[PDB]
A paper describes a structure:
Extensive crystallisation trials with CAL11–160–[name]‐A101–225–H4 and CAL11–160–[name]‐A144–225–H4 yielded two different crystal forms: form I that diffracted X‐rays to about 3.5 Å and form II that diffracted anisotropically to about 4.4 Å. Particularly, while the N‐terminal half of the [name] α1 helix packs against [name]‐A α2 involving electrostatic ([name] R18 with [name]‐A Q90) and hydrophobic (involving [name] L11 and M14) interactions, the C‐terminal half, mainly aa W22 and F29, is sandwiched between [name]‐A α2 and H4 α3. Within [name], the conserved residues in α1: W22 and F29, and in α2: F43 are completely buried in the complex, so we hypothesised that these interactions are crucial for [name]‐A/H4 binding. His‐CAL11–160, and any proteins bound to it, was captured with nickel‐NTA resin and subsequently analysed by SDS–PAGE. Overall, in vitro binding assays together with interaction studies in cells indicate that the interactions mediated by W22 and F29 are crucial for the recognition of [name]‐A/H4 by [name]. All [name]‐A chaperones compared here use their α1 helix to interact with α2 of [name]‐A in an anti‐parallel fashion, occluding the tetramerisation of [name]‐A/H4 heterodimers. Our structural analysis presented here shows that although [name] appears to have evolved independently of Scm3 and HJURP, it employs evolutionarily conserved and adaptive structural principles to bind [name]‐A. Recognition of [name]‐A L1 and α2 by the N‐terminal 50 aa of [name] is similar to that of Scm3 and HJURP.
Centromeres are microtubule attachment sites on chromosomes defined by the enrichment of histone variant [name]‐A‐containing nucleosomes. Instead, fly‐specific [name] appears to combine the roles of both HJURP and the Mis18 complex: pre‐nucleosomal [name]‐A recognition and its targeting to the centromere for deposition, respectively (Phansalkar et al, 2012). In this study, we present the structural basis for the recognition of [name]‐A/H4 and [name]‐C by [name].
Author numbering:
A (entry chain A), D (entry chain C): 47 to 120
B (entry chain B): 27 to 98
C (entry chain F): 17 to 47
E (entry chain D): 29 to 99
F (entry chain E): 17 to 46
Write the structure that this text describes.
């Protein structure tokens, strides 16, 4: 897993950003679920960008593939 | 994003089967994370706000994830 | 398939939550 | 456009296949809409597979790219 | 499924400059997939609505009930 | 930019249809 130390800062940033008027508090389960989701989602999207990498018969993932991925899935 | 652990990006890459990584990748990955988490939190907060509750819950996270479509 | 795995994980998320926080006022205790 | 001669072949095949006990009558407007949709969708998906082609610095679209496309969008 | 040259003409519309010989067969498969889903959905909706005829609106319902149509 | 074009095309499909067919009994005349 990634550490909570820098992760919770970003969760806090965005809770503050999109809560209407009161910062919207948080549960522990919410934090754990967000962390789980983001870890497996980054694993997933890296794997697919590396599939693009493999597709062009090179083994080194680079921003070419990351950007094609961004163009595919917004 | 600023502190999202560099070797943690490496560890997620190695889980995904990525063998070699470019140096630019970390900032791009950080951008990706910001996008994803930002959308999720947006949706979750918005649902918590519609339900007239004060606390984001795991169920609200589930609603936000489900209201993505391109997660798969 | 990816979809089955994500749906499993989300079914999992329907679980344990407790420990409401006032994010900053509690994030000091995440070190 | 593609010709109706072989297209309605397939439209009939699949109306018959999923019909639920009565062959399902299929108006002229339905036929035209299906034809339009399939033509622009094939143009689209060919263009995207050719984007994969370009991505690997070759100009000749081949089943390598078609199959990667199949993996991406089922 | 598709003719032979109509595949070429759609490729040339899509900006494809050169094509492999296998492509046509693969392209046909693609078409078979797409239409087969669309008609399915359309028929099913026509079947839910208890009507006897597939319509342009039923085609629209089938297309909209795809999601991956755009990219 | 694709989504706008598809939504236009679908808005177009919202137009007249007529000529119910009995697919096989019709398709001889195609």
């Amino acid at each position: 897993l990634i550490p909570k130390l820098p992760f919770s800062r970003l969760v806090r940033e965005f809770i503050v950003k999109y809560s209407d008027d009161e910062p919207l508090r948080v549960t522990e389960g919410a934090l754990l679920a967000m962390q789980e989701s983001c870890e497996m989602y980054l694993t997933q999207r890296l794997a697919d960008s590396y599939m693009l990498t493999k597709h062009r018969n090179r083994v080194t993932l680079e921003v070419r593939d990351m950007a094609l991925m961004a163009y595919i899935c917004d | 994003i600023q502190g999202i652990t560099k070797p943690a990006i490496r560890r997620l890459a190695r889980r995904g089967g990525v063998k070699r990584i470019s140096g630019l990748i970390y900032e791009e990955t950080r951008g990706v994370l910001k996008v994803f988490l930002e959308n999720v939190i947006r949706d979750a907060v918005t649902y918590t706000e519609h339900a007239k509750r004060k606390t984001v819950t795991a169920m609200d996270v589930v609603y936000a994830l489900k209201r993505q479509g391109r997660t798969l | 398939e990816r979809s089955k795995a994500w749906s499993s994980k989300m079914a999992d998320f329907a679980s344990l939550e407790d420990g409401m926080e006032i994010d900053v006022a509690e994030f000091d205790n995440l070190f």
